[PDB]
């Protein structure tokens, strides 16, 4: 009799329209001492999972419903239906005749199920624009355990009363009331202090009296506490796309839409309308628990097997067949024993079906010619896998362990992730759908969030319009660089305590000394941590043994009709649905293309299965550090390590991946491996006592602890641990729960003691392991990813030109990657030929010892334009001249834009016209010919300057191919430059000597030190080779204007030698 439950609230799932995050919201419900709360979002049930979980923990009853978007007529019909005369425009059916709101709440578990279904049918059958509409027809069929109200102002009853259609309003109420029932109909009354609500008040109370509808108070809250209303206003401007200054923008009137106290709400309503407040309590008593919806169940598909068999038996049979195929003349010793052990584990844990499903997917793919990758993650450690065809890496030779992948003692579920090539990953999703059902397979949702960089850009737009992007850019490009992907929080820039304060000085400078920047920043802080939009998970596919619609809410992406799921992946798996990960890889595609190029350019047919792992040529390449374009080995650091390591065998490759770990660089493990191997450093026993037990386990890695697998074996020998138990020890050591980690010492200590070890030795091993036990790599992953690295390297080493063509084709879109790769080709000696109209195809092509640029990779030119161009040439001649070109081409390819691009690229150079000439003539000529379609056009003799042509060519192609700037100026620099780049590289020059090098600048990189003062690093490449130059914070200020790519410069520097790297440190640029 003294409290109020709120039944109409909006969370942040009503995207860019609600502001109330669930944990803050439930904090307030507690402080105000209310029994229960409700959530009723706008045409979705996407946040039901988070809400149910949080309320149950914090002891509050959860009520879940939806605010539907109903349709004036049929859901299928997509014609706007206004209900009144033109003048009453702003008081009619909302969204210009599209929709009318309704409030629905789930009393029972049954009710919540029906509500999930109704929501799904709406996206499938009733989508108009961005609103998924139910209609009166749907709701009747699926209507048990739901409670409905006469609705907000934007609902039907109230819109009718506003326009004066009073009899019509009464008719609507009686319709909706019959659908649901006498007890499930309530009259909604809200007061916020405006007239539109007040005029109708008499109207509503009248209808209620006539039809005996009980009344209910609600407050339509979109935010938690009053101080926040300012923020709700900036949010609405993000959704609606209009500036704050603009008069006609959507807005709320006055800050009453918040979680009021019980006392506030009783005064406002208790005097005039008796019982509005008391009914809110009566509803809350009626709601029952929704636990059953969330109780976990077994819902994995069951694989069909031939007669006289079960899942177990068929697994055994398929394993046996696989062993024969791999080992034609008989399995080696012990292979049979490992298989039988593993099969029993899988069968005990009841996962036979899972393995068979994964196998079929790989087999179908192999038939169809889709490449599948060697292995990813932890799966390469199972023999059952290698036999079934899933994995192409043999467990037993390399020492990988089964317990890492599946642990006998623990209870969990296996996770296999599979890579398919980038282009044809799509077919796989479809095929899975075909095989298992269209109603049983779906993709999975992601919820996007606003972080620092996003919020700066939303704020600039709402304050300053579409012209605001330029300012937002300047601020965003002046933040300090990010540690993993995560970036400095917005609070951090201005708060002394936070660790990164020193780093952020530059941006703060602007905040304090510019009005506009300061205004953007203040709005931004409010817009952070809020959900912005829906998205779709990059790899996941959910599968079920039953129709998905009986378990979860679903939606259909409008563009392609794909089914997606309502809840996200942690949430789906919790109730027992199967997740599978199909990943895309682009390096798999490059491999396919280079094989095919050889078949045509030369005659060989190549099978990568039967290439030896010991090719001399591969290792010469890896050792010289020429690894641009090789999987995983691209970085500037990793190239230097490979130089020092000088690899000799496949084992050295598996290791280089795992030793550049975020720990090992600083924890200095990678310098050791290199030196121990090359006899510059001496192996060190951990302790004199323990040398001999642990000699073999650590011999491969020259005495260091590199792999997680090495750790599990150590525990076995010294402390006599079962490999299953050693597995638990690794995980616990990782998380560092101190109480457990303490207990861990007891077990380890006791075991080593019984074996007969000293107190001192026991202490030593523990001490060494803890540092090395958060930076230890999974060996299975490095073996699988090492193979792909080796294959890429072999193909580059034996067939140079054919490989580079496959590579350049894949990076057509990204013009920064293309620039890197095109310079590589030049140094290797390959000649890339300029694009051409008659002798080029869509993709780059290997023609003898050269490559011809692909037309599909010019800027602004698309697939469809080039497709048409080629057919014309096929059918109706070569293109003789520019005029002939204009005559023959169809309408689609006549665009002014396409034509100018090709002029600058050099596509018409063969035909013999000068480049500038075509450009000036192009505008008029296109029009004339296009007119006829719906000519001898003269070409002028003028040409752009060398520098400028190259600048423009770079724009369209990514780098210049026809010539190089230094060509033609190379001699000039030579006269003035005291020291050749080759000499200094060779080590001829004494350390710390003045020098005057000259060349072209490339790959300028911007860096900021701890105190925040910007500086730059660049490569001064000349005709042959280059030496790295560093311009320091002070240097960067005085001469910092000219440090931009592709500038011929003269640098005054100082020779600096360190750790086998020779570099220049410079002060003056002319
Ligand atoms: C969730 O975090 C990711 C980390 C990945 C991030 C960076 C690379 C990093 O580990 C990644 C990766 C995919 C790791 C796997 C262990 C995998 C687990 C779930 O199986 O994913 C992760 O752990 C990537 C790469 O494949 C391996 C070889 C690692 O690459 C390097 O460390 C590396 C350094 C230099 C070149 N490669
Ligand atoms: Zn709203
Ligand atoms: Zn509403
Ligand atoms: Zn509402």
Numbering used by the authors: 7 to 940, 964 to 1099
The authors write:
During DNA replication, the β-clamp interacts with DnaE1, the replicative DNA polymerase termed variously as DnaE, DnaE1, or PolC in different bacteria, greatly enhancing the processivity of the polymerase. However, mycobacteria rely on only one replicative polymerase, DnaE1. We have reported multiple lines of evidence that nargenicin acts as a DNA replication inhibitor in mycobacteria by targeting the essential DnaE1 polymerase, an enzyme identified recently as a highly vulnerable component of the DNA replication machinery in Mtb. Assessment of the antimycobacterial activity of nargenicin, a natural product that targets the replicative DNA polymerase of Staphylococcus aureus, revealed that it is a bactericidal genotoxin that induces a DNA damage response in Mycobacterium tuberculosis (Mtb) and inhibits growth by blocking the replicative DNA polymerase, DnaE1.
To elucidate the mechanism of polymerase inhibition, we determined the structure of full-length Mtb DnaE1 in complex with nargenicin and a DNA substrate by cryo-EM. The structure was determined to a resolution of 2.9 Å with well-defined density for the polymerase active site, DNA, and the bound nargenicin molecule. The cryo-EM structure of Mtb DnaE1 is identical to the previously determined crystal structure with the exception of the oligonucleotide/oligosaccharide binding (OB) domain that was not included in the crystal structure. The OB-domain is flexible as it shows a weaker density in the cryo-EM map when compared to the rest of the molecule. The DNA is bound in a canonical manner between the thumb and fingers domains, as was previously observed for other C-family DNA polymerases. The nargenicin molecule is bound in the polymerase active site and is sandwiched between the last base pair of the DNA duplex, the first base of the template strand, and the fingers domain of the polymerase. Nargenicin occupies both the position of the incoming nucleotide as well as the template base and thus mimics the position of the newly synthesized base pair. To do so, the first unpaired template base is displaced from its position and bumps into Pro668 of an adjacent helix (residues 668 to 673) that becomes disordered. On the protein side, nargenicin occupies a shallow pocket and only makes three direct contacts with the protein: Arg667 and His787 make a hydrogen bond to two oxygens in nargenicin, while Gln638 makes a hydrogen bond with the nitrogen in the pyrrole ring.
